[PDB]
Amino acid sequence: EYYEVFGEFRGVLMDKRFTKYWEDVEMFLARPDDLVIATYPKSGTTWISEVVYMIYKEEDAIFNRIPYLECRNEDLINGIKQLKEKESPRIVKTHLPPKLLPASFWEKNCKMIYLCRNAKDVAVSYYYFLLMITSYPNPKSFSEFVEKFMQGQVPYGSWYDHVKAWWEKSKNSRVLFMFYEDMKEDIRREVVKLIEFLERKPSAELVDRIIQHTSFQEMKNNPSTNYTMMPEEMMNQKVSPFMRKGIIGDWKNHFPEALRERFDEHYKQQMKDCTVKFRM
Amino acid sequence: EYYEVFGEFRGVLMDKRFTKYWEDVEMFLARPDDLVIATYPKSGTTWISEVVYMIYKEGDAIFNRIPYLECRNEDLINGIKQLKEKESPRIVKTHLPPKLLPASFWEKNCKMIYLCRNAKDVAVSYYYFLLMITSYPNPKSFSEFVEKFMQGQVPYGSWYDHVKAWWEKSKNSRVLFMFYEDMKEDIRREVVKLIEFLERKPSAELVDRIIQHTSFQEMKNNPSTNYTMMPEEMMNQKVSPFMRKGIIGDWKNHFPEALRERFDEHYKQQMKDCTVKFRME
Numbered sequence A: 001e002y003y004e005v006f007g008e009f010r011g012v013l014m015d016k017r018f019t020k021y022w023e024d025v026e027m028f029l030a031r032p033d034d035l036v037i038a039t040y041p042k043s044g045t046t047w048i049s050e051v052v053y054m055i056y057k058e059e060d061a062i063f064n065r066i067p068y069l070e071c072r073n074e075d076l077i078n079g080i081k082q083l084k085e086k087e088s089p090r091i092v093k094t095h096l097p098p099k100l101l102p103a104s105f106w107e108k109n110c111k112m113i114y115l116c117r118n119a120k121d122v123a124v125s126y127y128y129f130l131l132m133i134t135s136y137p138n139p140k141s142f143s144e145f146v147e148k149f150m151q152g153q154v155p156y157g158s159w160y161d162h163v164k165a166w167w168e169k170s171k172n173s174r175v176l177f178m179f180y181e182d183m184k185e186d187i188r189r190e191v192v193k194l195i196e197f198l199e200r201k202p203s204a205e206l207v208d209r210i211i212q213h214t215s216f217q218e219m220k221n222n223p224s225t226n227y228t229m230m231p232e233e234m235m236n237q238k239v240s241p242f243m244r245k246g247i248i249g250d251w252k253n254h255f256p257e258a259l260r261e262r263f264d265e266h267y268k269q270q271m272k273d274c275t276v277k278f279r280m
Numbered sequence B: 001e002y003y004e005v006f007g008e009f010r011g012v013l014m015d016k017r018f019t020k021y022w023e024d025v026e027m028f029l030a031r032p033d034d035l036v037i038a039t040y041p042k043s044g045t046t047w048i049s050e051v052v053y054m055i056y057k058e059g060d061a062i063f064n065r066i067p068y069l070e071c072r073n074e075d076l077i078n079g080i081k082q083l084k085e086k087e088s089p090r091i092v093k094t095h096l097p098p099k100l101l102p103a104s105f106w107e108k109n110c111k112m113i114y115l116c117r118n119a120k121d122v123a124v125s126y127y128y129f130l131l132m133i134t135s136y137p138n139p140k141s142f143s144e145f146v147e148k149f150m151q152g153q154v155p156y157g158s159w160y161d162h163v164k165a166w167w168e169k170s171k172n173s174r175v176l177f178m179f180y181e182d183m184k185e186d187i188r189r190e191v192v193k194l195i196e197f198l199e200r201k202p203s204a205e206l207v208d209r210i211i212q213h214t215s216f217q218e219m220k221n222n223p224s225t226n227y228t229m230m231p232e233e234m235m236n237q238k239v240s241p242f243m244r245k246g247i248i249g250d251w252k253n254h255f256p257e258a259l260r261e262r263f264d265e266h267y268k269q270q271m272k273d274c275t276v277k278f279r280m281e
Ligand SMILES: Nc1ncnc2c1ncn2[C@@H]1O[C@H](COP(=O)(O)O)[C@@H](OP(=O)(O)O)[C@H]1O
Pocket: A039, A040, A041, A042, A043, A044, A045, A046, A047, A121, A124, A125, A128, A214, A215, A216, A217, A219, A242, A243, A244, A245, A246, A247, A250
């Protein structure tokens, strides 16, 4: 059952396998040069993760090169253990809201990159992800999933609270805030911005290489990034592939008119006092 | 389909996920002090693995403490990688027949322990294991599974060829040959023998600690050894538990009379000239 798999932890709905040993995450020891990549699920984490890795490097699965902090499935999968054995400088992936991130990261003043995507398109991507994950109950319908999304009753909680809290943290010059739609409409600009934030020289050669290797077509056929290195028993891509469409606007093919009006109205009430600038 | 999952490799039927990157196994680098624990599937590997580990520690999931050499599932599970990162002295688990084991192990003259169990009881245990593994097609019936077993058309091939080849290897004083039924009927004797082979003192305190910790009842309740640390999506124990019965003679509850006669007759022709001494039961 849905609520046998997921349960509220400190006001955030979470996969119980990731909170059973919460102590390991809360007491995590950060290093001054650690870099944190944070996102709400299905906002382009894999895309920006590969861009940053390439920058660091001017085959092994991406989930091995950049460990997923809080991911845990008893003794078979353990992100914390992977990080303890990782040589510096480490790149750390996470989907946690600011109130749940290990305090050591703030204490040590580590650099961080937060990426977001428009809410309607995130909901479409998340719906298919639940179908893909074998141990996650399939929603009875897209609409039923959207009602849960609006209530923040999906893994990692409310998208609204997630974006608002990370936007506030981005007041800090060491926390970079970025958008999926900006990477889609002006990739060269976003890559140069990332190279500069990480204190490196943006050369035409480096910038072109990254733009070339990180296209959706490129990443969909790279076994290291398309998640085919992860067993079908856990993630069945026969049901739905990880690199699905990679576009802006798929909400137009899933949201009936009545539902869209209610969602957009709800969005307004939620994001009233937030200054974040999403692309038109 | 059965043969979409399994394929013959150098005359041995194998899970294709374990042979896709065979080069990683063939070129494996052994160390002089490595210890190899080899068995045909479902013969008591987990039981003897825990006994040996306890000996090393003189009184974390078992698949992490003692890596399964050839086990591989793309980038999620990789026994070779685990071993490269393991501090010595390493304990290595494997289900491979002698002709498929990495040659480096023979070149370095490493010590090894081989364990076997009577064929009829192994077939019963193996049948339930296929039901347990989610990605393995469930046999249509026990009899159909037995026909495949007699033909060597099950993962890791012919049980007959496996036992005969390892028995020949045991001529070497550094390769110990043992039986599941001997551990069941005379555990203290078998434990003292293992402590001595690994060059340690079989004190009364030590022997007694091992015997109590490795009973079927204890291990069935120990999350480290009962394979509950492995996701149900891969191994569903709701279908059949890993620590199933742990007895001698369950074949009597599965083999119809007609089938048993044919199996035993076939066994005779396969093992006619083998001097191996199985226990009377
Ligand atoms: N190089 C790339 N360019 C564009 N979209 C990409 C991409 N790599 C991944 N994506 C998209 O990012 C989403 C997955 O996000 P995450 O990595 O956070 O889980 C998917 O969205 P869609 O389901 O809409 O296709 C996927 O197709």
